[PDB]
Design a protein around this ligand. Structure first.
Ligand code: 7WY
Length: 109
């Protein structure tokens, strides 16, 4: 699938050194206990992160680009739901989503 190759390219870019200064909070699943966020899993019903997206891509879990996009956008939405809007991590999410949305928009079709 041409479109899933494009998705995989986006994924690689989101994980690349170019964006690491703001992407790193999204690299792994939120470890709420380790971070002291003992209300995280009461607020967030469907955790998501880039390592999970990568695993799903490697396992051929995604059947289309929209399913991939749904997971990436869910990851950002969780950040916007859990954190106050002026939190540093929300600023990082907005920057990484801008990277994602502009390249996702270039999807071959
Ligand atoms: C994703 C996500 N969505 N909401 N949060 C996080 C998040 C996820 C992982 C980490 C993390 C911490 C340490 C570490 N070694 N690895 C990873 C930190 C997070 N937060 C967070 C706070 C502040 C700054 Cl500036 C950035 C990040 C706030 C909580």
């Amino acid at each position: 699938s041409e479109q899933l190759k494009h998705c995989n390219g986006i994924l690689k870019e989101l994980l690349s050194k170019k964006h690491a200064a703001y992407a790193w909070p999204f690299y792994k699943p939120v470890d709420a206990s380790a971070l002291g966020l003992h209300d995280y899993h009461d607020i967030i019903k469907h955790p998501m992160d880039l390592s999970t997206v990568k695993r799903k891509m490697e396992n051929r879990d995604y059947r289309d680009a929209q399913e991939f996009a749904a997971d990436v956008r869910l990851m950002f939405s969780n950040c916007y739901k859990y954190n106050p809007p002026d939190h540093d991590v929300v600023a990082m999410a907005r920057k990484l989503q801008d990277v994602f949305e502009f390249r996702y928009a270039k999807m071959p079709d």
